[PDB]
Symmetry: C4
Subunit: 274 residues, 4 copies
C-alpha cells in the first residue's frame, strides 16, 4: 500500500501519545495505550510485517480476543518518542485462534518484553467489550497530574470522588455518568492490579489508581483521550478551588439530577445521593 506509518491507526496512535506527552501526563515511560483494530485495517499492509512474527503465549487464555489485532505502545517506550519513530515505539499484535497467545506482526523490533502490559490491558478490553456490546476499542493509562494530586486529599472512594469530579465541570456527569472507580493502592504490573482494574471496568469507563494515575476506555482514540481529558480538567479546576480554600458554592444534587434527565443518562446512584 502506502507505508503503514501513514495509516489512520499509526497516525492516530502518534496523535494521542503526543497530545498526552504535551499535557504533561506521560513522563519517562509512564503510560500505555492499546487500540483494538479489525483485520481490514491492517490487511493492506501485510507485506510490511515481520517475516516471522514473534509468538508470545498468554498465561491466561482469552478466547473473547481470538484472532483480534491491536496496535499498542511498547513496554518501556516513551510517549514523547512515538512521533519520532513509530515503528520502534509501537507494535501491531494479533491474538491467535485460541486466545492462547499473540503474534507481533509489526514494530517493536519483534520483541516480547515491550508487550509485557498487554495481558492486563487485554483483561480490561474483554470486560469493556462485554459491557459495551463491542463498542469500546481503546484502553489508555496515563499519569494525569491533577487526578493524581487529588488522590492524596479526597477520600479514595468511588462515590465521593466521582461526585467531586462531577461538580468540577458541568459536562462531567454527562461524559462519565457511570463515575470513576477508585481502587486501593496496589503494586503495579501484577496480576492482582490487572484483575482488579478489569473488575472496575465492568461498571465504569474510568478507573483511578491512587498515587499513580488513571485508566480509561472508549470507542475511539479521540473519545478515550477526551474522556480522560474531561476528568483531568475537572480535577485541575478542583485543585485550584481547594487551593483557594474550598467551594463557596457548587453544582447541587438537584442540578445534577436535572442535568442527567435532560441528557438522558443515569448517574451513578451513590455519587448522586451525596
Amino acid at each position: 500500500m502506502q507505508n503503514i506509518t501513514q495509516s489512520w491507526f499509526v497516525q492516530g496512535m502518534i496523535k494521542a501519545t503526543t497530545d498526552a506527552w504535551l499535557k504533561g501526563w506521560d513522563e519517562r515511560n509512564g503510560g500505555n495505550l492499546t487500540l483494538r483494530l479489525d483485520d481490514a485495517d491492517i490487511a493492506p499492509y501485510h507485506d510490511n510485517f515481520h517475516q516471522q512474527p514473534r509468538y508470545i503465549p498468554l498465561s491466561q487464555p482469552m478466547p473473547l480476543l481470538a484472532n483480534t489485532p491491536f496496535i499498542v505502545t511498547g513496554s518501556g517506550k516513551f510517549f514523547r518518542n512515538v512521533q519520532l519513530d513509530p515503528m520502534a515505539n509501537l507494535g501491531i499484535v494479533k491474538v491467535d485462534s485460541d486466545g492462547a497467545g499473540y503474534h507481533i506482526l509489526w514494530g517493536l523490533f519483534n520483541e516480547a518484553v515491550p508487550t509485557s502490559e498487554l495481558p492486563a490491558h487485554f483483561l480490561s478490553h474483554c470486560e469493556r467489550i462485554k459491557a459495551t456490546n463491542g463498542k469500546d476499542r481503546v484502553i489508555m493509562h496515563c499519569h494525569a497530574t491533577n487526578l493524581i494530586a487529588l488522590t492524596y486529599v479526597l477520600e479514595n472512594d468511588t462515590a465521593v470522588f466521582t461526585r467531586q469530579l462531577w461538580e468540577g465541570s458541568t459536562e462531567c456527569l454527562v461524559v462519565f455518568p457511570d463515575g470513576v472507580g477508585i481502587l486501593p493502592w496496589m503494586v503495579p504490573g501484577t496480576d492482582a492490579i490487572g484483575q482488579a482494574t478489569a473488575q472496575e471496568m465492568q461498571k465504569h469507563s474510568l478507573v483511578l489508581w491512587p498515587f499513580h494515575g488513571v485508566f480509561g476506555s472508549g470507542p475511539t482514540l479521540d473519545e478515550t483521550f477526551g474522556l480522560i481529558d474531561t476528568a483531568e480538567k475537572s480535577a485541575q479546576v478542583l485543585v485550584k478551588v481547594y487551593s483557594m480554600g474550598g467551594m463557596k458554592q457548587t453544582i447541587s444534587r438537584e442540578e445534577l439530577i436535572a442535568l442527567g434527565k435532560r441528557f438522558g443518562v443515569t448517574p451513578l446512584a451513590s455519587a448522586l445521593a451525596l
Copy 2:
C-alpha cells in the same frame, strides 16, 4: 478560486480553535465558535459547496439574520481536530430569506446535528448586532479554566465578579468596561439558557456560566479571543493571589475611575461603586 480551506475565514477559525485548544480551554467537544460572514466572503467558493445544501428549520425564526452566512464549529467536534480536517469539523451555513431556517453550504458532511447549538448562538448574535450597531460578528464559548474555578469561590454576581476581574489586571476595565454578566447555573443546551445568555449579551460582551465556562462576543475572531484571554488572564492572576492568602493591596476605586476617564470608557456603575 483557491480552495476554500485556504480562505481567510477557514484559516481564522483554525487559528482560534487551535489557540483555544492549546490554552487548555476546550477539552473533548467543549466549546463552540460562530463567525458571521458576508456573501462576498463565501461567493468565490460557491462551486465547492454541497450540491444540495441541507435545510434545517429554526423553531424560532430570526428575521434579523435573513440571508446571513456564518462559519461554525460542529456540534460534537473537537477544537483540537479543526486544524487536521477543517471541512469535517467546521460548517458554513446561510440563514434563509425569512430567517426561518438555514442551509448547510459546506462542511460537516452536510449533517444537521453538528449545527444543534446554532439557534442559541444566533439569539446572542442578534442581541449583539443590535447592541453594537452591527459591529460584533463572533460568539465564542469555551471552558476557560481559571474563570471556571473562580465561580466556586467568588460571589456569582455581575458587579462583584466584574470588580475582581478589573482588579486582577490593569487593562481589564478598558477591555470590558461593561463587565461580565454572571447567570445562575442552568442546564446547558436548553432554550432557557440560550435566552438568558442573549439577555445578558444586551448589556455585556462577556457572560459567565457558573461551574461551566464563558461566552464572549466581538467584531473579529482575534478581538473576541483576546477579550476572553484578557478575562482569563486576570482570573489566572486572581487564582494565584487567592491561593497565596488574598490581596494585601489592589487597584483602588479611585484608580479605576481615573483609568476609565483616561481611556474614555464608562465603567459598569455597580462594579465601580464597590
Copy 3:
C-alpha cells in the same frame, strides 16, 4: 537584498514576541517591544521601504536619539500575530536629525497610531543608553503572570521585592544585582508613567508596574527576554512557595553576599541589608 522579513532583526522580533506569547505573558495587545538598530542593519533593504515614510513629531524632542533607527511592535497589535504577518505587526522607524520626530520606514501600513507608545519607550532607551554607555538596545514590556500576582501580596517596595526575587532562584542576584524598581500604580499610557519608568531605568534594568506588568532593558533581544524570564521564573517559584505556606528556609544574607563577591557584582544595598 533578500527580503527584509528574513533579516536578523525581523526574525529576532518574531522569535521574542512569539516566545512571550507562548509563555502566557501577552494576551490581546498586552506588551510592547522596541529594538534599537544601526543604519548598517537596515541599509541593504532601503528599496523595501515605504515610498514616502510617514513623519510623526515628538512632542518632547530627544536629541540623544537623532538619526537612530528602531524596529518596534505596533500599538494595538497582538504578539501572537507577529509570526503570521511581521510587516503588518512590526514597524521600522528612524528618528530625525533633530530628534524632533521619526519617519516610519517600513511596516505598520505606514500609520502613526501603532507607534503611540514609542515616546515612552524612547525615554527609557535614552536613560539606558546613558546608564550603560550605549550597550543597552532593547526595551520590553510584558504582562509576566507571576510577577503581576506578587504585586498583590508582597510590599511594593524596590528593596523588599528585589530581595524576595533574589531568594527565589540563586541566579537572580547575579542577573539583576541592581534590583527591580517598583513604581506606584499609575494610569498607563501617560506622560507621568513614561517619565517615572525612565527615572527608575536610571538605576535598574527591570521595573515593575503593580497590578500590570514588567518593563526590562538589555543589550540584545535574548538578554532582555532572558532577564525578564529569570525574574518571572523566580516569581513562579515564589508563588508556589507562598501557596504552600511560605518559606521554611531560604538563601541567607550571608549567602547572597558571598554570591555577589564570587560573581563580581555589587548587589543593591537596601535589598541586601534585609
Copy 4:
C-alpha cells in the same frame, strides 16, 4: 559524511535541550548538559572539525577520562537557541591522552569560556563511571521548577526529601531507588560545589542544589531527562498537594517495601525507614 548537525548525538542534544526549554526548566542560560561519546560516533565527521582545535588545560587532571570525547552545551548559551544554531551553542570536546586538558573539536566558535563548567561535569562523570561500571554517559543540570520550590518548604535532607518524592508518584522508588542527594546551598561555579556534587553522585543518580536546581545522571539522554522529569513530576504533584493543605493519605512504608521487592530494587534505607 552527512553533516554532523544531522548526527544522532547533535540531534539528541537538540531534542533534550529543547524539551527542557519547553518544560520551563531553563530560563536564560540556566542549565548545562554533557554527553560522553565514543570515537566511533565522531570519527566520520572529523573533516568538519576546527582546523586547529583549541586546547584547554584542566587544573585537576582526570586520567579516567583520557582520550574521551563529549558533546556539551556552551557556557552562557541558551537552551532555547540550541535548535536554531547547534554549532554556535554546542561543542564537541575530546580529553587528551593524559587527562590534563581537552581540545575543542567542533562548535562554540572554538572558544574556551563556553566550556567553563566542564571540569565540574567531568568530576561527576568520573564518579558515575565508577559507580555504574561505565554505563552512565550523561550529566544534566536544569532549574526544575517544582523541585526548586520544594527546597524552600521541605527539610533539605536526603532521606526526608527522597521519601516525599517517592510518595508523590508510585514509579519514583523504582526509577530512583538510591534517592536524591540534597547538598547545603553553595555558591555555584566553585571547586567546592563541583566536588560536593561529585561526592553525592557516588551514591545517587539525582542531586539537588537548594534554591537552585537539580543535577542528574544516566546512560542515555532520554533516560537522564526521564529521570529528572520523573522527580519533577512528583514534585509538581506534591506542590499541588501541599497547596491544598497536605496529604490526607499517601503511599505507606509497607507499600513502598512491597513495591521495591516486586521491582527488584533496594530502596535507600534511611528514606524507607521514615
